[model samples]
Target: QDLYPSRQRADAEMRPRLDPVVHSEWTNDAPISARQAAAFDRDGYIVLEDIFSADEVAFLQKAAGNLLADPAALDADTIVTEPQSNEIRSIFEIHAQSPVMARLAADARLADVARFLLGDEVYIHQSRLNYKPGFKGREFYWHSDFETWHVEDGMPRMRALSMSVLLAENTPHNGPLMVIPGSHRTYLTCVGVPDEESLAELAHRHGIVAPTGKPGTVILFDCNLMHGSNGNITPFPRANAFLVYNAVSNRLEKPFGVERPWFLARREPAALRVERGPLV
Candidate 1:
């Protein structure tokens, strides 16, 4: 028999299986204490609260709205994907358009945290805006972010981190993120393909949790951690901004986007001093 005969049926099955309790406490303003860092080291992910003030979140949301309003702001170079059965639609690289995003991308606090986790000399590897409209059928598949990198290159030697900041309140009913704790170290090796069994094992081993919280809360995880969100069945949208950071020596290849280069040029005098090399 086919494991999943139809998308609708699969979605229905997945919904009921999800843990309902909202893991909102993860978003509390507890400092990154030794215990917290140890948890991240052991599990490959941690959720932190109030990364940005409410006012800052509001300003960034406004900036996102403004950037979305202008279609021309997203040139042809940026790829846009249609909504899938999961409510995910319109993926685009907006790093160059919004100053608010630029500010967040270069925030000292984020850098400090990233450096503490991944060591010094970090550069943003990728950034995108994920807008999940309510009632949208599309949902992202359960997978690790670094799998693609591993296939294209090889097993990453240095650490790379993926961070998501909720731009709106997220709850289980509204499509909050579901993560399999401690999956980073073992899941990829356990299964030839990322599948349900691997996810269950990870959840059982380290205790899975759903992180729900107010806007401005940031969730950081190892790039290898298996994670994904369900479709937004509720009436409101689930908006999030994801920024990935990697070691500077990771050698970012190809065209450096306009937004990051421009922002760095203005903020770091060293960027202006370099005449020939690409933005490093």
Candidate 2:
């Protein structure tokens, strides 16, 4: 938002730091097995495949595309923008505005996983669908969502989860999601928009790992995980439904005079009750 290297603090030294609350005990749930959680502690992310059926993914795909095509869907709770010709850069706040997505937001499949990782009741912090069109889609400078949430949104801690549900195939040739495994344990002095040098410096120390998958695949990651993706130049485009959740205790702070719209930053941190079985 400001400029590159928007430092969180000029004094934040380059160091590795792990969340004090993270432990093997919290990783206890059906969606996230103890083995998966153990791996996540080591890797900071995990891919759960085929849990979302083809029909389920198709429904989500239709919803995303239809929302993009309909101008009537635009509202106070939404931000829709297309940065390139016929290519959408992002669709923000879909969870609050769409009936179908609202249900999916509280769907056990996702909320359960969030609960498992956070080890507490969670509330939706933000939600969006990012469409990276073929040939024209742009890339994101590597940055941590927790850094921005902490500084800008008054988020107290990093007890949160960020997941990307793929509605399209994520192939290496078509630009796949990449991460610096275990980088979540580190602290970087800089913040705001990331630059090549900064992104490389923080990411290179740990090797780059790309996780690619087909439709119905979900990449559940830590909020502090160093993550980014490449531009898709190939004919096949990519899109994913992205959502963030924070532990109820870690709810954002509100000053005496402070106020934020529910869309940009949720005002209420109600625990969304996840329904069981098919989300139809």
Candidate 3:
């Protein structure tokens, strides 16, 4: 896809700025009610607890370790460091190398949620493992994931979703994912404004929350949501697995790679037809 229509045109226009982070609290007992859906529609985020059992999380952690143990498991080109926060280490596009990762990426439960939020025709685009060891410089700078994937004008609204599964217990001190609620709907005008007044206004309009939870918890958010994480202030590592999903009709851009099926299941013709698009 082409970047936004005209870079110069976008640059010449004045746009509202947004903060890099937004915050919210999660309660397992709370129902994912209509209000929650409205919040997601407005802010582009929703959190679910116990998305996986402890054993499932442990299994994935072990699988990740095994992959890291192999000298050939990852090539130097696969690793990328966050620009400002160098404390985090990332390994991307590993779907074919790790069976555990493949399984996690293909997890039907996760897919069901993706379908519910995005549509039934969702396609898996990218999967990555991010490891933030304690005391590492903040690994990720505040930015929107779609900024890298979408051409400036070609960006689709709410067409893509990202699932970040915690592989280990995460706390604010341990560098949990930070988000700015509702920022996804604000368009690309606020991409890189670093002014203090702009940031303050961004925070005022959106909440910034550090999501902390036990292993197996998953966070689903719109791809355009502004988010980032800081360095782990504690003594343990903060490990997370992220899967990006998009509508089948949408085309992925360069550097991000294209989508390939991680898993597929047969269904009755009637059922398949009925489930062809957004689950809702």
Best by TM-score: 2
Every candidate's lDDT: 0.58, 0.73, 0.60
Candidate 3 on 206-274: residue-level lDDT in tens?
Answer: 879877888888888987777887776688888778888766655443322221222211111111111
In model 2, state the lDDT of residue 67: 77
Give lDDT tens digits, candidate 1, residues 122-200.
6666677776777763567677665544433332332668788888788778878888876666525322246566567
Ranking by lDDT: 2, 3, 1
Error of 1 at 28 (Å): 20
Can you rank all candidates by TM-score, best first?
A: 2, 3, 1
The segments of candidate 1 whose C-alpha lies over 4 angstroms from its true place after superposition are 1-31, 83-88, 153-155, 187-193, 252-280
Range of the 10 consecutive residues with the lowest summed lDDT in candidate 3: 264-273
Instruction: State which candidate, 1 or 2, has the greater lDDT.
Output: 2
lDDT at position 144, candidate 3: 68
Pairs in clash, predicted candidate 2: none
The lDDT leader among the candidates is: 2
